[PDB]
């Protein structure tokens, strides 16, 4: 079936259309899967009692301006208008729910979070909460990964046995005494390194206090949340592989704009991947009549970004394209052709911006375009370069050092040094007069004089006879 | 036409004519075999190092000439240094030993 | 340059604000100037000769 | 430079291609379109390939002759000659490996006969169409079985560990990286003797002669799979402005923009976590753009945009124009004219017009007019010959 | 490509780090074992003495040479005077402290406990002698941090590890200095984990 | 006092090369300096009191004494600039401060060791010294000076340590000494050297 096909567009279609189009009621079926998906996540942050900790400082600073009314709420579910009441409605259960374990010790802490379900969050900081408990894994994971090596490859203890008592808990003294008790050489050897195995898991002891709960609940807090995202990862992918046939239908209108065909339909994917990200089905509008906007949005933003060599901004391509949509409409009515001023009347530009917008859009001629007659010659053989200098222009500056080293040598000694130090003659950077005056040690307005009358002497004739010859 | 010194091309620094001074002649591949047939090997060296392609070995050969000191310091042509940058820009690595 | 920057101060040769790039006849040619035409962008004044 | 000899050539390791370059080129844009100074971190940078005007930074804070070595703090240009913009190099950092189209598609596939793999199978792996195993261990699979999409998937349900299948250009970097040229060298020194076949023991000595090159030379095998593509210097692919507004770009700034753009997107899809139908289509699309740079034409012939002729890649610049790129040299001090007869000359002399000889022997004539004192300085001799 | 063969603890290697992290130089450091980097850095350094700089073409040791390089090449912010009168002052003041005090701390680490008391208190009276002078400027004879304090900030950071301290006099005008300089991000992002635990900061 | 004039104040060493290194750069810039060939047993009074480190040489210009010749011969090359003695480029200026450090720590201690060393060390030093000084022999063909075609301070670190050649019992030998010896003909008789050389150090030249 691989009939020696090469180009990817053959390979894209051959791999893409294996999947099948989704019916309309199927799409609502999939979105209802994602809709349960994130709910498994955010409702798995209420289980995290530090859920309001990152935000309680926000509302303890929202009024006091360390947070804005937008990035945390957008209108509660099922502004001083709502923020001053709903979060204020949380100030009751806030500490009273943590009061029990200051038994119902987990009902109250759950009772605060159990009502948290009607608290609306914003895409800004939702990531950070997933970024918060995530790194706590690696803070507990690699430590636990060392518990094997610290107990197996150092004590000779097996790994698959001691984990039964200590994994999940991560704080007790399970192998502290249970592993040691078995009368083995590794167990008796456990008392040898019993501190580092006890101290390495100390910073995680902060972690359970870092969220105030045990390491067990911390496990289900971070682990049960993972299923929620992975519940949606396979969910969103099902819609990108299904409507993937759509982008090829929308992205063929732009086939010639300097961008390859296959660089186009890859730009729509990053578009469509955002549409299903922000898709909402309850408004009833089918996925196509909403995904068509976010898709064509991208391919017209990509073309203005990577279609030109000398890139022109995105706000200008709206003005260039307006000049052809309007210089084409005046082409039929007027019949003859459009003038550089009638666009100023038809449009509303200042009669010169239309003269600057015309000196832009032209692309660069390729430096290998074969010139006339198609001889063995290209355009790149005829463009001389101007950075270099005429070797008669370099043969003079080399010659000029003769005179200024000879003519200026025909002066007196002390009056020629400052003449050479006052310019950059044969030296480093030039200098200031009283900047020089601290060299001859007679600091005064004499230094403006010694050079002054000396430069007159070179100005006289027969001392400038060779020097004058460089003028024109 | 006739040319003693003029423009120089852009990527490779050999001569051409865009400044009312056309390029020099074409000392093509067929005409180097007629300078190796004779033993002529000082004419051949300056005919492709100083007179054409070297960058600072020819600005000296113009200042030696104006002073009556016919003598050259060849250097390495600028059309070979582009052939190392054009090979290294592949995976290939190219260098020169030292001795 | 530094050396020439002394050459100016010695004679006071005023450096010009404008560089000369006029059109001069190509070398090795001679003949009367039988005709002259001038094209101007519509929006810039015509000089006397124009 | 000293009296060198023995130009030496060999493969280039990603730790060396990272050593020529002076910085990472991480955007596709070239110049500014309003003031034509080049942008920062783009292709035509100034912090990477040096400055533009001789002896001065880009912003305009360092022009004096006092500051001649310092690097500017605003825009980190090093204030030196603009000639150095002609011999520096950048480098792009590929987001995924990719095969070197020379060492993969040259007729004896140097990736092929180093692995003993039919070239029609390597190509079936570089397009992500068929898995390939690595380190099978104790199972019913060799080291280089080609599991199709099902056979692996019909194999993966049984085993989860002790087994690793890859796919794509990042697989051949796995096969090469673990293969050892000493074990299969001497172990093939015996296998050649047992084989009795005028064809078998004739090509068999061909492979064992290649393995014997990848050891004494000093080149590991996995350097034929690129990981940092180096970029030319910005004065050997100029963007000179023509007279009248148009620019005349070389045909490489059309190809480099096509790798840095596709490579820049593939950096994004691994942060946005797209499905493996797209990102697996990205690497397959990048790898066709790195191989349109090295030697364009051994593929679909990615013809130029805004025009209908094929672009001109790097390996189409050394490749014969009937001869070399260097010297196999247009020449100064020349001329030409229509020959005639002149039968009054001796055997050893030819005519030469006054109008020509006064133009070839110009630098000599300048010698006399300043030696005999007839001209005071050389500028005053240029106006006596005119 | 600008690498540095930094020491993990030695005040010299902590010297250059303040200059680098001050100027904003993009650099990558390669650590030495204790005060010995590999035997592999003898080819680019026949002395085998750290620190040593390698910027793409160049090799430099004896940080006196290194630090003035980075100051002379990376211009702003500047760490020296402007006119030749005062540069001799700073260039000479730093020759004092690198001659009297630094080798004085030799026998405090590499000298027996007998001579450790010798360097300890005889140095301390010097420590508070210039202490009232901090009522002239913020820094050691400057209204803005410069090269001259570059030998003190990594010097003061070694106090509690050696065993000398401020107690009453010598702490009023002095301790205001370290609380003013130890907060700059340059000295902040210069602190390595090995040199940090010497003190509570 | 010492700083009480608009001129310098220098308490030089009549035989100590620390002075004679400073002398060349001192006079090569064309300034009027006071010479005082003084001893460690009896230097001048002002050299003792205003010099709280008490070294030789010692320069004093209206603000304070300066010593540690690299500091001295730097203060003059940074304040009295014409002619120049050090390059412009901070790359070539770095190593130009680097060769000097590779002479005060490489070819100085061979002078002190020969001043206070045993009979074989005076040969061992002369062995390591004389032959290796021929090891850098081919350098002078490419450059009329120590890898810097203009006269610069890195050359001044050599000549005073090349003017005490036989003074501690040294003589060159081998193939290609004409290159280095002919080089000494190009530097040992300059105005900055000829007018600066002290007659006390000259007499060893016969
Ligand atoms: Zn700048």
Contacts of A71 (CB under 8 A, 6+ apart): A122, A124, A125
Chains B and F touch (3+ CB pairs under 8 A): no
Alpha helices in A97-210 (DSSP H): 105-114, 123-151, 159-166, 185-190, 196-199, 203-210
Considering only CA atoms, which of F14, F19, F3 is closest in space to residue F68?
A: F19
Whether the CB-CB separation of E134 and E177 falls below 8 Å is answered with yes
Structure tokens that stand for D182 in this block: 């000493």
Whether the CB-CB separation of A408 and A419 falls below 8 Å is answered with yes
Considering only CA atoms, which of F95, F110, F199 is closest in space to residue F154?
A: F95
Inform me whether the C-beta atom of residue A417 falls under 8 Å from chain F C-beta atoms.
yes
Considering only CA atoms, which of D288, D89, D99, E57 is closest in space to residue B86?
A: D89
Helix (H, G, I), strand (E, B) or coil at D304: coil
E strands in chain B: 2-3, 25-26, 93-96
Structure tokens that stand for F165 in this block: 């050649």
Whether the CB-CB separation of F129 and F113 falls below 8 Å is answered with no
Between chains, do D19 and E74 touch, taking CB under 8 Å as contact?
no
* Dist CA D235 CA D84 (whole Å): 10
Contacts of D121 (CB under 8 A, 6+ apart): D130, D146
Across D295-311, b (16+ Cβ under 10 Å) vs e yields bbebeeebebbeeeeeb
Which element (helix H / strand E) includes D178? Answer: helix D169-178
- In a domain? residue A72: no
Contacts of A250 (CB under 8 A, 6+ apart): A268, A292, A295, A296, A299
The four Cα atoms A61, A66, A69, A72 give a dihedral, to 10 degrees, of -90
Q: Determined by which method? A: cryo-EM
Inform me whether the C-beta atom of residue D294 falls under 8 Å from chain B C-beta atoms.
yes
* Dist CA E80 CA E88 (whole Å): 10
CA distances from C21 to A259, A385, B77, C37, C47 (A): 41, 17, 33, 20, 19
Structure tokens that stand for A397 in this block: 């500056």
Whether the CB-CB separation of D143 and D135 falls below 8 Å is answered with yes
Structure tokens that stand for E92 in this block: 């000479």
Across F152-165, b (16+ Cβ under 10 Å) vs e yields bbbbbbbbbbbbbb
The four Cα atoms D195, D196, D198, D201 give a dihedral, to 10 degrees, of 20
CA–centroid distance, residue D16 to ligand 1 (Å): 30
Considering only CA atoms, which of F30, D282, D180, C9 is closest in space to residue A417?
A: F30
Confirm whether residue A468 is marked as ligand binding: yes
A41 & A162 share domain: yes
Whether the CB-CB separation of D382 and A392 falls below 8 Å is answered with yes
Indicate which CATH number applies to the domain containing A402: 1.10.10.10
Contacts of F64 (CB under 8 A, 6+ apart): E89, E92, F3, F50
The four Cα atoms A5, A7, A13, A14 give a dihedral, to 10 degrees, of 20
Task: State how many domains chain A has.
Answer: 3
Domain boundary among A306, A338, A357: A306
N- to C-terminal Cα distance for chain F?
40
Give the count of beta carbons closer than 10 Å to the beta carbon of residue A175: 23
Contacts of A207 (CB under 8 A, 6+ apart): A136, A139, A140, A215, A218
A246 & A222 share domain: yes
Structure tokens that stand for D1 in this block: 């430079």
Domain boundary among A245, A273, A306: A306
Give the count of beta carbons closer than 10 Å to the beta carbon of residue E167: 9
Parent domain of A375: 307-387
A274 & A320 share domain: no
Contacts of F24 (CB under 8 A, 6+ apart): F156, F159, F160, F192, F193, F196
- In a domain? residue A74: no
* Dist CA D80 CA D50 (whole Å): 8
* Dist CA D165 CA A467 (whole Å): 82
Structure tokens that stand for A1 in this block: 């079936």
Indicate which CATH number applies to the domain containing A84: 1.10.601.10
Whether the CB-CB separation of D289 and D101 falls below 8 Å is answered with no
Chains D and B touch (3+ CB pairs under 8 A): yes
Length of chain E: 201
* Dist CA B26 CA D335 (whole Å): 10
CA–centroid distance, residue D32 to ligand 1 (Å): 16
Structure tokens that stand for D44 in this block: 């035509």
A297 & A279 share domain: yes
Whether the CB-CB separation of A422 and A435 falls below 8 Å is answered with no
What is the dihedral sign for C-alpha D150, D155, D158, D161? negative
Between chains, do D73 and E72 touch, taking CB under 8 Å as contact?
no
A114 & A225 share domain: yes
* Strands D90-99 and D334-335, sheet pairing: unpaired
Domain boundary among A387, A409, A440: A387
Give the count of beta carbons closer than 10 Å to the beta carbon of residue F191: 10
Whether the CB-CB separation of E32 and E8 falls below 8 Å is answered with yes
Between chains, do F98 and E65 touch, taking CB under 8 Å as contact?
yes
Nearest residue of chain B to residue A395 (CA atoms): B63
A324 & A454 share domain: no
- In a domain? residue A1: no
Considering only CA atoms, which of E94, E109, E201 is closest in space to residue E163?
A: E109
Q: Across the interface, which of D19, D22, D71 has its CB nearest the CB of E73?
A: D71
What is the dihedral sign for C-alpha D275, D281, D283, D286? negative
Taking CB atoms and an 8 Å cutoff, what residues of chain E touch D70? 72-75
* Dist CA A19 CA A33 (whole Å): 19
Chains linked to A by 3 or more Cβ pairs within 8 Å: B, C, D, F
- In a domain? residue A71: no
The four Cα atoms A335, A340, A341, A347 give a dihedral, to 10 degrees, of 80
A278 & A425 share domain: no
Whether the CB-CB separation of D75 and D81 falls below 8 Å is answered with no
Contacts of E45 (CB under 8 A, 6+ apart): E5, E52, E59, E61
Q: What is the DSSP string of A128-139?
A: HHHHHHHHHHHH
Helix (H, G, I), strand (E, B) or coil at D24: strand
- In a domain? residue A282: yes
**D249 bridge partner residues:** A366, D239
Inform me whether the C-beta atom of residue A390 falls under 8 Å from chain B C-beta atoms.
yes
Structure tokens that stand for F80 in this block: 């009295």
Tell the burial category of F182 from Cβ atoms under 10 Å away from its Cβ (0-12, 13-18, 19+).
Answer: exposed
Considering only CA atoms, which of E12, E53, E17 is closest in space to residue E190?
A: E17
Resolution of the model in angstroms: 3.7
Rounded to a whole number, what is the distance in Å from the CA of B3 to chain A's nearest CA? 14
Q: Dihedrals φ, ψ of E53, to 5°?
A: -105, 150
Considering only CA atoms, which of F85, F89, E20 is closest in space to residue D70?
A: F89
Mutation target to probe the E interface, by most E beta carbons within 10 A, among D71, D75, D79, D84 is D71
Considering only CA atoms, which of A306, A362, B10, A299 is closest in space to residue D43?
A: A306
* Dist CA A166 CA E4 (whole Å): 45
Length of chain A: 472
Helix (H, G, I), strand (E, B) or coil at D48: coil
* Dist CA E93 CA D180 (whole Å): 61
Rounded to a whole number, what is the distance in Å from the CA of A386 to chain B's nearest CA? 8
* Dist CA A309 CA D257 (whole Å): 8
Confirm whether residue A465 is marked as ligand binding: yes
A278 & A421 share domain: no
A149 & A296 share domain: yes
- In a domain? residue A423: yes
Across F134-143, b (16+ Cβ under 10 Å) vs e yields beebeebeee
Tell the burial category of E44 from Cβ atoms under 10 Å away from its Cβ (0-12, 13-18, 19+).
Answer: middle
Tell the burial category of C25 from Cβ atoms under 10 Å away from its Cβ (0-12, 13-18, 19+).
Answer: exposed
Nearest residue of chain B to residue D338 (CA atoms): B1
* Dist CA D311 CA D297 (whole Å): 9
A300 & A316 share domain: no
Give the count of beta carbons closer than 10 Å to the beta carbon of residue E26: 9
What is the dihedral sign for C-alpha A154, A159, A162, A165? positive
- In a domain? residue A290: yes
Residue A176 DSSP label: I
Give the count of beta carbons closer than 10 Å to the beta carbon of residue D327: 17
Omega of the bond prior to D354 within 30 degrees of 0, cis?
no
- In a domain? residue A236: yes
Which element (helix H / strand E) includes D369? Answer: helix D362-371
Considering only CA atoms, which of D278, D121, E51 is closest in space to residue A247?
A: D278
Give the count of beta carbons closer than 10 Å to the beta carbon of residue A162: 23
């Amino acid at each position: 079936e691989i009939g020696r096909t090469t180009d990817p567009v053959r390979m894209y279609m051959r791999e893409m259309g294996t999947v099948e189009l989704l019916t309309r009621e199927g799409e609502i079926d999939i979105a209802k899967r994602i809709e349960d998906g994130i709910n498994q996540v955010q409702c798995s942050v209420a289980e995290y009692p530090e859920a309001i900790t990152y935000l309680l400082e926000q509302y303890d600073r929202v009024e006091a301006e360390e947070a804005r009314l937008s990035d945390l709420i957008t209108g509660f579910v099922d502004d001083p208008e709502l923020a001053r009441e709903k979060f204020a409605e949380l100030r009751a259960q806030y500490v009273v729910t943590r009061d029990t374990i200051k038994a119902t010790a987990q009902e109250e802490i759950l009772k605060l979070s159990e009502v948290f379900k009607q608290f609306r969050l914003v895409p800004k900081q939702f990531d950070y909460l997933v970024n918060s408990m995530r790194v706590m894994m690696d803070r507990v994971r690699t430590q636990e990964r060392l518990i094997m090596k610290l107990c197996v490859e150092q004590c000779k203890m097996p790994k698959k046995n001691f984990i039964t008592l200590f994994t999940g808990n991560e704080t007790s003294d399970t192998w502290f005494n249970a592993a040691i008790a078995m009368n083995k050489p590794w167990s008796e050897k456990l008392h040898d390194v019993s501190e580092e195995v006890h101290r390495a898991l100390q910073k995680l002891q902060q972690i359970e206090e870092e969220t105030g709960l045990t390491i067990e609940q911390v496990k289900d807090i971070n682990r049960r949340m993972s299923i929620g995202e992975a519940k949606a990862r396979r969910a969103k992918k099902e819609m990108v592989e299904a409507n993937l046939r759509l982008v090829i239908s929308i992205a063929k209108k732009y086939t010639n704009r300097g961008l390859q065909f296959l660089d186009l339909i890859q730009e729509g994917n990053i578009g469509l991947m955002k549409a299903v990200d922000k898709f909402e089905y309850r408004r009833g509008y089918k996925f196509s009549t909403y995904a068509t906007w976010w898709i064509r949005q991208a391919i017209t933003r990509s073309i203005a970004d990577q279609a030109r060599t000398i890139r022109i901004p995105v706000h200008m391509i709206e003005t260039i394209n307006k000049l052809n949509r309007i210089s084409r409409q005046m082409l039929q009515e007027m019949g003859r052709e459009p003038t550089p001023e009638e666009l100023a009347e038809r449009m509303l530009m200042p009669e010169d911006k239309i003269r600057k917008v015309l000196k832009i859009a032209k692309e660069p001629i390729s430096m290998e375009t074969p010139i006339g007659d198609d001889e063995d010659s290209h355009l790149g053989d005829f463009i001389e370069d101007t950075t270099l200098e005429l070797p008669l222009d370099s043969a003079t500056t080399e010659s000029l050092r003769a005179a200024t080293h000879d003519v200026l040598a025909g002066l007196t000694a002390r009056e020629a040094k400052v003449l050479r130090m006052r310019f950059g003659i044969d030296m480093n950077t030039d200098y200031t007069l009283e900047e020089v005056g601290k060299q001859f040690d007679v600091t005064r307005e004499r230094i403006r004089q010694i050079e002054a009358k000396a430069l007159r002497k070179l100005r006289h004739p027969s001392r400038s006879e060779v020097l004058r010859s460089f003028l024109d | 036409h006739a040319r003693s010194t003029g423009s120089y091309s852009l990527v490779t620094q050999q001569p051409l004519g865009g400044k009312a001074q056309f390029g020099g002649q074409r000392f093509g591949e067929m005409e180097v075999w007629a300078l190796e047939a004779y033993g002529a090997a000082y004419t051949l060296q300056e005919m492709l190092t100083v007179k054409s392609d070297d960058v600072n070995g020819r600005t000296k050969m113009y200042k030696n000439i104006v002073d009556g000191n016919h003598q050259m310091e060849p250097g390495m042509p600028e059309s070979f240094n582009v052939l190392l940058k054009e090979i290294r820009s592949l995976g290939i690595n190219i260098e020169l030993e030292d001795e | 340059t530094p050396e020439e920057k002394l050459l100016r101060a010695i004679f006071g040769e005023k450096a010009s604000d404008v560089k000369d790039s006029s059109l001069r006849v190509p070398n090795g040619v001679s003949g009367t100037v039988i005709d002259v035409q001038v094209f101007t962008r519509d929006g810039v004044e015509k000089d006397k000769r124009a | 430079t000293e009296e060198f000899d023995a130009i030496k050539i060999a493969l280039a390791s990603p730790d060396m291609i990272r050593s020529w370059s002076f910085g990472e080129v991480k955007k596709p844009e070239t110049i500014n379109y309003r003031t034509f100074k080049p942008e920062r971190d783009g292709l035509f940078c100034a912090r990477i390939f040096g400055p533009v005007k001789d002896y001065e930074c880009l912003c305009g804070k360092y022009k004096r002759l006092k500051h001649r070595g310092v690097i500017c703090e605003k825009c980190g240009v090093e204030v030196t000659q603009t000639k150095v913009r002609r011999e520096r190099m950048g480098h792009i950092e590929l987001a995924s490996p990719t095969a070197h189209i020379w060492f993969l598609k040259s007729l004896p596939s140097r990736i092929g006969l180093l692995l003993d793999m039919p070239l029609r199978d390597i190509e079936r792996v570089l397009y992500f169409e068929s898995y390939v195993v690595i380190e099978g261990g104790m199972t019913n699979l060799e080291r280089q079985q080609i599991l199709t999409e099902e056979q692996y998937l019909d194999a993966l349900e049984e085993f989860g560990d002790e087994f690793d299948a890859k796919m794509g250009a990042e697989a051949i970097q796995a096969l090469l990286k673990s293969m050892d040229l000493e074990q299969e060298c001497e172990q093939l020194r015996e296998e050649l003797n047992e084989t009795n076949s005028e064809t078998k023991r004739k090509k068999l000595t061909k492979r064992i002669k290649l393995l014997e090159a990848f050891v004494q030379s000093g080149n590991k095998p996995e350097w034929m799979i690129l990981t940092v593509l180096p970029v030319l210097p910005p004065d050997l692919r100029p963007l000179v402005p023509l007279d009248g507004g148009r620019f005349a770009t070389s045909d490489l700034n059309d190809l480099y923009r096509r790798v840095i753009n596709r490579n820049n997107r593939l950096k994004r899809l691994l942060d946005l976590a797209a499905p493996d139908i797209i990102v697996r289509n990205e690497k397959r699309m990048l790898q066709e753009a790195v191989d349109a740079l090295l030697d364009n034409g051994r593929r679909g012939r990615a013809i130029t945009g805004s025009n209908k002729r094929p672009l001109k890649s790097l390996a189409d610049m050394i490749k014969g124009k009937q001869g070399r790129f260097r010297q196999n040299k247009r020449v100064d001090y020349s001329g030409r004219s229509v020959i005639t007869v002149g039968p009054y000359l001796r055997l050893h002399q030819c005519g030469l017009p006054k109008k020509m000889a006064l133009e070839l022997f110009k630098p000599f004539i300048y010698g006399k007019l300043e030696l005999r004192g007839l001209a005071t300085t050389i500028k005053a001799a240029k106006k006596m010959v005119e | 490509v600008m690498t540095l063969f930094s020491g993990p603890t030695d005040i010299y290697s902590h010297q250059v780090r303040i200059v680098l992290a001050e100027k904003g130089v993009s650099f990558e450091i390669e650590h030495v074992e204790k005060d010995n980097p590999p035997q592999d850095l003898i080819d680019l350094n026949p002395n085998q003495s750290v620190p040593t700089l390698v910027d793409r073409e160049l090799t430099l040791w004896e940080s006196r040479i290194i630090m003035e390089y980075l100051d002379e090449r990376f211009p702003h912010p500047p760490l020296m005077p402007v006119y030749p009168v005062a540069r001799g002052e700073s260039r000479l003041y730093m020759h004092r402290i690198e001659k009297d005090w630094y080798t004085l701390m030799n026998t405090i680490i590499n000298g027996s406990a007998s001579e450790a008391d010798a360097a300890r208190k005889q140095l301390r009276e010097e420590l508070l002698a210039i202490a009232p002078v901090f009522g002239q400027k913020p820094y050691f004879l400057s209204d803005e941090f410069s090269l001259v304090d570059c030998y003190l900030a990594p010097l003061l950071w070694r106090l509690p590890q050696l065993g000398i301290e401020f107690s009453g006099p010598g702490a009023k005008e002095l301790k205001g200095y370290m609380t003013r300089v130890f907060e700059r991000d340059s000295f902040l992002a210069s602190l390595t984990e090995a040199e940090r635990e010497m003190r509570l900061g």
